[PDB]
């Protein structure tokens, strides 16, 4: 079929979602696309190139709260941004794994630059803003990774509090724990920011 | 070589550390151990059994701050516990990936039960204690996963704050951002706990 960038990425997203990050082979991608391996190689050099491109596309498609609103607080932006990043990661099988270790792409420069400048305009040094941003990213990735891999994994002598914790854990999709943790994180940054030079 | 549980796990840990989670194949494990595949199969049924066992062993070996000390605060326990969990995950290539989606093993029951009871003895409901514990686990896993996969990945037109953030990011191993985020998390749980029924 068609082998422009957009279509090879569509195909790889479909393949990822069907087979997960282990089935995302250049050989199985070639089968999907109805082509021989040397034909695919012209367009896609290896699995790592595909993984990087998929990371970028996942957020392009489904990460919709990338930028603060007019007059939005840094707290509200971080909350909205995290919920969005989470939704985007959960859209595809192993989407969080796909993101891991990536760095901002050139196509994301203006956006992420705006995110960093915004934090500094709200009083954070660049370093402290980055630390907040990274903590939100890492917490979200962690939570999503554990939720997704646990669903994958699925394929009495318990002590009482653990038994209860497991029901709680298995009683929703993970969103309740994620949102509680998110509020904790945001408020911890707020304490630190407002402390200035005071022992806190 | 020897094929008791302890030795098959040693071997798989060595293999994981050499080849990462993709090289942890039952076929490459068999080569390592100097045996045929049907011989390995008697002892190890599949990659998933191996992954679960490795998750447990990684913490048995190198996760040394599993339980609070006499009179230790819940804040200090969480800090010490997270630093320990982090050290343990970083000990082996893809160790965080190996942990993802696992649930407590029977061998960990008494320990994790103690962790949960401890939080409740410090004022958290089981649910709120679990939410704190999960947030710490998820944040640590996220941070480690991003650090490790980025090292794996490694194989000018930047906007200024991003350029700076990237140097900051690449200026240490990840520990500074992790520890800053950790303090934020812990203090956010503390605000929430102490709030009781007050709007916070
Ligand atoms: C917090 N939230 C999930 C962020 C986000 O909304 C992003 C996006 N493109 O809209 C990211 O790129 C974002 O998700 C993301 O992936 C970020 C990063 O990886 C980095 C890295 O790796 C190194 C330096 C700076 C950044 C960053 C500022 O761009 C990070 C911003 C993250
Ligand atoms: C926070 N810290 C890193 C914890 C820890 O030190 C552990 C350990 N064995 O010492 C875990 O097992 C610990 O790391 C860990 O992996 C935990 C969990 O997976 C769960 C799951 O998955 C579901 C219910 C309850 C737990 C839990 C209470 O045992 C979690 C405790 C985590
Ligand atoms: Cl074409
Ligand atoms: Cl607002
Ligand atoms: Cl503020
Ligand atoms: Cl033997
Ligand atoms: Cl203490
Ligand atoms: Cl307290
Ligand atoms: Co990223
Ligand atoms: Co766990």
From Swiss-Prot, chains A, B:
Induction: By the [Mg-tetracycline]+ complex. InterPro entries: DNA-bd_HTH_TetR-type_CS (IPR023772), Homeodomain-like_sf (IPR009057), HTH-type_TetR-like_transc_reg (IPR050109), HTH_TetR (IPR001647), Repressor_TetR_C (IPR004111), Tet_transcr_reg_TetR (IPR003012), Tet_transcr_reg_TetR-rel_C_sf (IPR036271). Tetracycline binds at residues 63, 81. Residues 25-44 bind DNA. The keyword Metal-binding applies. Keywords: Antibiotic resistance, DNA-binding, Magnesium, Metal-binding, Plasmid, Repressor, Transcription, Transcription regulation. GO terms for biological process: negative regulation of DNA-templated transcription; response to antibiotic. GO terms for molecular function: DNA-binding transcription factor activity; metal ion binding; transcription cis-regulatory region binding. Mg(2+) binds at residue 99. Residues 2-62 form the HTH tetR-type domain. Transmembrane segments: none annotated. Homodimer. TetR is the repressor of the tetracycline resistance element; its N-terminal region forms a helix-turn-helix structure and binds DNA. Binding of tetracycline to TetR reduces the repressor affinity for the tetracycline resistance gene (tetA) promoter operator sites. This is Tetracycline repressor protein class D.
